[PDB]
Amino acid sequence: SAAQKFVKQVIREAFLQDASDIHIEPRQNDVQVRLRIDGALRPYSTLPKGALNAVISVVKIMGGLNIAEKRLPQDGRVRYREGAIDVDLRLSTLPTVYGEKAVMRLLKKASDIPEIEDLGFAPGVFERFKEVISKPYGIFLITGPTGSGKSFTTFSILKRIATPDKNTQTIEDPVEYEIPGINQTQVNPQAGLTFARALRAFLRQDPDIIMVGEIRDSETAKIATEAALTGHLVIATLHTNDAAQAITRLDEMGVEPFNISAALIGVLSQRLVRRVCEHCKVEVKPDPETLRRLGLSEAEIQGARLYKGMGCERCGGTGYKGRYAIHELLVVDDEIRHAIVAGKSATEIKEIARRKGMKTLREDGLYKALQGITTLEEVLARTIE
Amino acid sequence: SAAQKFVKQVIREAFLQDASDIHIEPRQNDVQVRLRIDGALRPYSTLPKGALNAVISVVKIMGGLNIAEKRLPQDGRVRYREGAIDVDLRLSTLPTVYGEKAVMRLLKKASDIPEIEDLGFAPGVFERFKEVISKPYGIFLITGPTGSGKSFTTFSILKRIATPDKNTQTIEDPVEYEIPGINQTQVNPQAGLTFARALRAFLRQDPDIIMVGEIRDSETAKIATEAALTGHLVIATLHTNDAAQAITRLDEMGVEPFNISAALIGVLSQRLVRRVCEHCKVEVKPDPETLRRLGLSEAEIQGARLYKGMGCERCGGTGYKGRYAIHELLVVDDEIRHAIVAGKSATEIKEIARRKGMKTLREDGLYKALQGITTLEEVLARTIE
Ligand SMILES: Nc1ncnc2c1ncn2[C@@H]1O[C@H](COP(=O)(O)OP(=O)(O)OP(O)(O)=S)[C@@H](O)[C@H]1O
Ligand SMILES: Nc1ncnc2c1ncn2[C@@H]1O[C@H](COP(=O)(O)OP(=O)(O)OP(O)(O)=S)[C@@H](O)[C@H]1O
Ligand SMILES: [Mg+2]
Ligand SMILES: [Zn+2]
Ligand SMILES: [Zn+2]
C-alpha cells in the first residue's frame, strides 16, 4: 500500500494536469517517474531501486497483467475511478535492462456513444454497412488492433438495432457503458461464468440480438457461430488486423468452414488516425507519383490536396486534436462464401472482395486525408502491413 | 405474496394473449417486464427495483432452482396449473449487471399442431407440397431460422402420413411434443446418444418414416441421406436462408452430390409473418410505383387489396394479431437433379426451380399481403427476397 498509494497519487496528479502519459522507468540506482505535459516529459518523482517490483505489481493488478511474467511485454487497460477522477489508462509493461518499465497512457474522456451516422463512414461504405447490420441474423465481426475503437462502434450499432420488440443480450469483459434498453452480463471467472458458459445460457434466454464482447476461445467461437446459424443476430469482436484474416482466424479456432460460410454476414476492420487541427491547418501539395502509387485514379490526381497541422497549443504539440476512424468493410456475398468453403487464403478473399467494390483502409484513409481530416502519414502508419 | 400475485397474473396474461415468452428484466432504476407475442416483444409492466429478488424467488421455487446462487445461470421445468391453466413452463435465470433476469417460456402441446390444410399454403403450392410428402421414400428438408414454424410443419406432416401400417421413428433434441402414434427418442449427450448414433440404430429398427430434428454435424447429414437412399422416407430440419441453399449446405457438410440428387424429394423454406388484426383492419390504397419495383405486374396491382391494422386493445396497439406462414417449396425434378451433380450453385438451382414453378419467400409473402392476410412491411422485414 506504500506502492498502491504512490500509484494512485501519480494518476491523480496526472489527471489534474491533463498529462497524456506516465512513465515508470528503472535506472541503475533508482526508479525515475515522468509525466508528459504539453508534449514533453517532466521529472515527477524518484523511487528507490527496491521499490520497483512493488509498484509494477500494483499497475499489473490494475490492468490484469501477469506478475510472474517479466521476460515479455504486456499491454492492458485500466478503467480507473477513484472519486472525482475517472480516467481510462492504456497500460504497457516492458522488460528493460534495469527491470520492468511501465507506461500508462491517459485516454481522452470517452464522451457518449454516437449515432451510426456520426461514426465517420464514407457515404458509399456507409450504405453497405447499414445493410449489413439490418439483417435478421448471422454474425457480424468487428476487428482491429488494441484500441481501434471496436467496442465504441459496437455500441453505436446496438444503439440503432436494439429496438423494444427485440431482446438484446450482451456478454462483456468488462462491461463498459450503461446503455438502456438492453441486458448486459459481465464475465465472472471467479464464479465460473465464462464467455462460453454465458453464451450457452443466452440461447435459453429467448434472444434476438447477441453481442459477444470478445472471442478468444474455440468454445465461444463455436457457440456464437451456431447462434448466428439458428437465427439470432450476433455482433462480436476479434483482434485481427485484416478483415479477411478474421475468417481465417475463425477456422483456426475450430469453426467448420461451412458454418463460417453460412453464418458470416461481413467483417469490419477499422483504425484510428489522429485528426489535424482545424486552426493551424495548411495546404500541402502531394507528389502525383505518390498518389498514383496509392491506387488513386489519374483524373482525380489534379484536385490533389493534402493537409497538415503546423501546430499551436490548441493542439499542444502535434498538429493534431481528436481522432477519426478508418474502415474497410468486407461484405460477404455469394462469391466470397464460395471462396471460404473452398480452400481460401485471406489474400484471395480480399481481392475477391475488392473486386465487387470493397474499399480498403488505405483507400478509405487516403480519401479522408484528401479532405483534411488526417495527414497521409497517419494513414500510412495505420495501414502498413 | 405480492410477488406471488405478480407471477400468477403475468402467466395468466401470457396464456390468454398467446405469448411465447415472459421476460423479467432488471434495469438501472426499475424492473421491466415484456411479453413476446407473435414473435415481437411487447411492454407488459414495470416493477419497482426492490421487488426483483422476491419475484425471482417465486420463479426459482417453481422450477426448483437454487436461491443462494445468483452468479450463475439456472434452468428448470414446471407444469403450471392455476384455475383452468395447464401449461408446461421452461424457466431460465441469468445474472445481469442489475441482477438476475428471468425468462419463462410457455410450451405448446400436440393439440396445437395443425392439419396440413391449415398450414397456410397457397392453393398452387399446396398440391405440390402434398405430392412431396406422399412419396414412399426420399429425404425432405424443412429449412429456415428458429421460430419459423419448422416443427409445426414437421408434425403436421407426420399427423397426415404416420399411419398405423408404418414405423415412424423420431430423433430429437429435445423432444418437444408428445405425439400419439409415433416413436420418439431424445438426444442424450451424457449417455453418448448422438443424433448420428441414434440414427445408426434406427436402420436396424425396421423404420418407414424417419424424422431428424436437426442436422448439425457432417456424419448425421450423411446417414440421413443414406437412409433416404435405401428406401426410407426422411423428414429433417436444416438452417438456410433459402430452399436452394439446403442442397448446397449438404454438399458443404460432406454429402456426395450424387447422393443428394438421388435422395432429395424437396426443400421447404419457411418464415412466419404477422396477421393483420381484424379489429383494426383498415383498407389502404396501394401505391403502384412502389408495387412495381417490387416485381408485381400491372394485372396484380389491380385486384390488390392491401390492409393495415390501426392499433387496438385486442392487438396491443401493434396492428397485428396472430401469425401466418410464407412458403418457398423446392420440388426436385430431373433438371434440378442434373444441376445438383455437375455442382451448380444455389443461385443456379434457385433459378431453375423458379422457372419450373417455385414461388420465392418474397413472392408467397406478396401474394398473401395482396389478400390482406398480412401487411407489406412484414413481408419485406421477413424476406431478403
Ligand atoms: N470513431 C472514433 N472516433 C474517435 N474516437 C474513438 C472512436 N472510437 C473509439 N474512440 C476512442 O478511442 C478509444 C478506443 O476504445 P475502444 O473503442 O474501446 O477500443 P477497442 O478497440 O474496444 O479497444 P480494446 O477493447 O481495449 S482492445 C476510446 O477512448 C474511444 O473513446
Ligand atoms: N403455420 C403457422 N401459422 C401460425 N403460427 C405458427 C405456424 N407454425 C408455427 N407457428 C407458431 O410459431 C411457433 C414456433 O414454431 P415452431 O415450428 O415450433 O418453430 P421452429 O423454430 O420453426 O422449429 P423448432 O426449432 O424445431 S421448435 C409455434 O410454437 C406456433 O406458436
Ligand atoms: Mg472492447
Ligand atoms: Zn493547431
Ligand atoms: Zn387490433
Short mmCIF file of N, CA and C in Angstrom, two decimals, chain B residues 190-249:
data_model
loop_
_atom_site.label_atom_id
_atom_site.label_comp_id
_atom_site.label_asym_id
_atom_site.label_seq_id
_atom_site.Cartn_x
_atom_site.Cartn_y
_atom_site.Cartn_z
N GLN B 190 -24.94 -37.06 -22.27
CA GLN B 190 -24.39 -37.68 -21.08
C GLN B 190 -24.22 -39.19 -21.23
N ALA B 191 -25.13 -39.83 -21.98
CA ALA B 191 -25.07 -41.26 -22.30
C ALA B 191 -24.32 -41.54 -23.60
N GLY B 192 -24.11 -40.50 -24.40
CA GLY B 192 -23.48 -40.64 -25.70
C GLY B 192 -24.45 -40.96 -26.83
N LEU B 193 -25.73 -40.66 -26.60
CA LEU B 193 -26.74 -40.87 -27.63
C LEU B 193 -26.85 -39.66 -28.55
N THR B 194 -25.95 -39.61 -29.52
CA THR B 194 -25.89 -38.56 -30.53
C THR B 194 -27.06 -38.63 -31.49
N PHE B 195 -27.30 -37.57 -32.26
CA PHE B 195 -28.09 -37.72 -33.49
C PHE B 195 -27.59 -38.90 -34.35
N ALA B 196 -26.29 -38.94 -34.61
CA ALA B 196 -25.73 -39.92 -35.54
C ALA B 196 -25.78 -41.31 -34.94
N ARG B 197 -25.55 -41.40 -33.64
CA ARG B 197 -25.60 -42.71 -33.00
C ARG B 197 -27.05 -43.26 -32.96
N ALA B 198 -28.01 -42.39 -32.64
CA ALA B 198 -29.42 -42.75 -32.72
C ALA B 198 -29.82 -43.20 -34.11
N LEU B 199 -29.54 -42.36 -35.09
CA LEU B 199 -29.90 -42.64 -36.48
C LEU B 199 -29.33 -43.97 -37.02
N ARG B 200 -28.11 -44.31 -36.62
CA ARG B 200 -27.49 -45.59 -37.00
C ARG B 200 -28.32 -46.76 -36.47
N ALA B 201 -28.86 -46.57 -35.28
CA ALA B 201 -29.65 -47.59 -34.64
C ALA B 201 -31.02 -47.72 -35.32
N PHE B 202 -31.49 -46.63 -35.93
CA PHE B 202 -32.84 -46.63 -36.49
C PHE B 202 -32.86 -47.57 -37.66
N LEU B 203 -31.72 -47.65 -38.35
CA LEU B 203 -31.61 -48.52 -39.51
C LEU B 203 -31.65 -50.00 -39.16
N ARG B 204 -31.53 -50.37 -37.89
CA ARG B 204 -31.75 -51.77 -37.50
C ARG B 204 -33.06 -51.90 -36.74
N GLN B 205 -33.91 -50.90 -36.89
CA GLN B 205 -35.18 -50.85 -36.20
C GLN B 205 -36.37 -50.91 -37.16
N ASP B 206 -36.11 -51.31 -38.40
CA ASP B 206 -37.14 -51.53 -39.41
C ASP B 206 -38.05 -50.32 -39.59
N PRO B 207 -37.46 -49.17 -39.94
CA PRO B 207 -38.25 -47.94 -39.96
C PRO B 207 -38.93 -47.73 -41.31
N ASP B 208 -39.94 -46.86 -41.37
CA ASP B 208 -40.53 -46.43 -42.64
C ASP B 208 -40.33 -44.95 -42.83
N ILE B 209 -40.77 -44.19 -41.84
CA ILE B 209 -40.57 -42.75 -41.80
C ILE B 209 -39.54 -42.43 -40.72
N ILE B 210 -38.56 -41.59 -41.05
CA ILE B 210 -37.58 -41.12 -40.08
C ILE B 210 -37.62 -39.61 -39.97
N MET B 211 -37.65 -39.11 -38.74
CA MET B 211 -37.61 -37.68 -38.51
C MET B 211 -36.34 -37.28 -37.79
N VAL B 212 -35.54 -36.45 -38.44
CA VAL B 212 -34.34 -35.89 -37.82
C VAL B 212 -34.56 -34.44 -37.42
N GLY B 213 -34.60 -34.20 -36.12
CA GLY B 213 -34.98 -32.91 -35.58
C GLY B 213 -34.08 -31.81 -36.07
N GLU B 214 -32.79 -32.12 -36.17
CA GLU B 214 -31.81 -31.16 -36.63
C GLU B 214 -30.56 -31.86 -37.19
N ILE B 215 -30.11 -31.39 -38.34
CA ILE B 215 -28.87 -31.82 -38.93
C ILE B 215 -27.76 -30.81 -38.66
N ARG B 216 -26.93 -31.08 -37.64
CA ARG B 216 -25.85 -30.17 -37.25
C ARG B 216 -24.48 -30.60 -37.75
N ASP B 217 -24.19 -31.89 -37.65
CA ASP B 217 -22.87 -32.41 -37.95
C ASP B 217 -22.81 -33.08 -39.31
N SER B 218 -21.61 -33.30 -39.79
CA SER B 218 -21.43 -33.91 -41.10
C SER B 218 -21.84 -35.40 -41.18
N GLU B 219 -21.61 -36.15 -40.10
CA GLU B 219 -21.97 -37.56 -40.07
C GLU B 219 -23.48 -37.80 -40.11
N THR B 220 -24.25 -36.99 -39.38
CA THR B 220 -25.69 -37.11 -39.38
C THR B 220 -26.22 -36.79 -40.76
N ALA B 221 -25.61 -35.83 -41.43
CA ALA B 221 -26.13 -35.42 -42.72
C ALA B 221 -25.94 -36.56 -43.70
N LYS B 222 -24.84 -37.29 -43.57
CA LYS B 222 -24.60 -38.44 -44.45
C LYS B 222 -25.52 -39.63 -44.17
N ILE B 223 -25.73 -39.97 -42.90
CA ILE B 223 -26.56 -41.14 -42.58
C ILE B 223 -28.05 -40.94 -42.92
N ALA B 224 -28.54 -39.72 -42.75
CA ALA B 224 -29.92 -39.43 -43.09
C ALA B 224 -30.12 -39.51 -44.60
N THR B 225 -29.14 -39.00 -45.35
CA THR B 225 -29.20 -39.13 -46.80
C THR B 225 -29.13 -40.61 -47.23
N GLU B 226 -28.26 -41.39 -46.58
CA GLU B 226 -28.15 -42.84 -46.86
C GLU B 226 -29.47 -43.55 -46.62
N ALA B 227 -30.12 -43.21 -45.51
CA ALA B 227 -31.38 -43.83 -45.13
C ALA B 227 -32.46 -43.49 -46.14
N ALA B 228 -32.40 -42.27 -46.65
CA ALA B 228 -33.32 -41.87 -47.71
C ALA B 228 -33.06 -42.70 -48.97
N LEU B 229 -31.78 -42.86 -49.28
CA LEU B 229 -31.32 -43.54 -50.49
C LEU B 229 -31.81 -44.98 -50.60
N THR B 230 -31.74 -45.69 -49.49
CA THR B 230 -32.01 -47.11 -49.47
C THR B 230 -33.50 -47.45 -49.57
N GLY B 231 -34.37 -46.50 -49.22
CA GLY B 231 -35.80 -46.70 -49.37
C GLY B 231 -36.65 -46.22 -48.21
N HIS B 232 -36.17 -45.25 -47.46
CA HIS B 232 -36.94 -44.76 -46.33
C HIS B 232 -37.30 -43.31 -46.54
N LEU B 233 -38.39 -42.90 -45.92
CA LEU B 233 -38.80 -41.51 -46.01
C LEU B 233 -38.14 -40.79 -44.85
N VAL B 234 -37.48 -39.67 -45.14
CA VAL B 234 -36.80 -38.94 -44.10
C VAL B 234 -37.18 -37.46 -44.08
N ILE B 235 -37.71 -37.00 -42.95
CA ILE B 235 -38.04 -35.59 -42.79
C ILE B 235 -37.07 -34.96 -41.82
N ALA B 236 -36.30 -33.98 -42.29
CA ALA B 236 -35.21 -33.42 -41.49
C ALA B 236 -35.19 -31.89 -41.57
N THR B 237 -34.69 -31.27 -40.51
CA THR B 237 -34.62 -29.83 -40.42
C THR B 237 -33.21 -29.33 -40.60
N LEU B 238 -33.08 -28.28 -41.39
CA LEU B 238 -31.80 -27.64 -41.67
C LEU B 238 -31.96 -26.11 -41.52
N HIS B 239 -30.85 -25.39 -41.35
CA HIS B 239 -30.90 -23.92 -41.27
C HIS B 239 -30.26 -23.29 -42.48
N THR B 240 -31.08 -22.67 -43.33
CA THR B 240 -30.61 -21.99 -44.53
C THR B 240 -31.54 -20.84 -44.81
N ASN B 241 -31.02 -19.81 -45.46
CA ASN B 241 -31.85 -18.64 -45.71
C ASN B 241 -32.80 -18.86 -46.90
N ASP B 242 -32.74 -20.04 -47.49
CA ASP B 242 -33.23 -20.25 -48.84
C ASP B 242 -33.43 -21.75 -49.07
N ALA B 243 -34.42 -22.13 -49.87
CA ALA B 243 -34.61 -23.53 -50.19
C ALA B 243 -33.42 -24.12 -50.92
N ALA B 244 -32.90 -23.40 -51.92
CA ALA B 244 -31.79 -23.91 -52.72
C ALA B 244 -30.50 -24.13 -51.90
N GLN B 245 -30.26 -23.29 -50.91
CA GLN B 245 -29.07 -23.42 -50.07
C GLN B 245 -29.04 -24.69 -49.21
N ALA B 246 -30.18 -25.36 -49.05
CA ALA B 246 -30.20 -26.62 -48.30
C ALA B 246 -29.46 -27.70 -49.09
N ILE B 247 -29.58 -27.64 -50.42
CA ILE B 247 -28.79 -28.50 -51.29
C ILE B 247 -27.32 -28.22 -51.11
N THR B 248 -26.94 -26.96 -51.27
CA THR B 248 -25.54 -26.57 -51.18
C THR B 248 -24.97 -26.87 -49.80
N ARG B 249 -25.77 -26.67 -48.76
CA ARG B 249 -25.26 -26.89 -47.42
C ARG B 249 -24.92 -28.38 -47.16
#
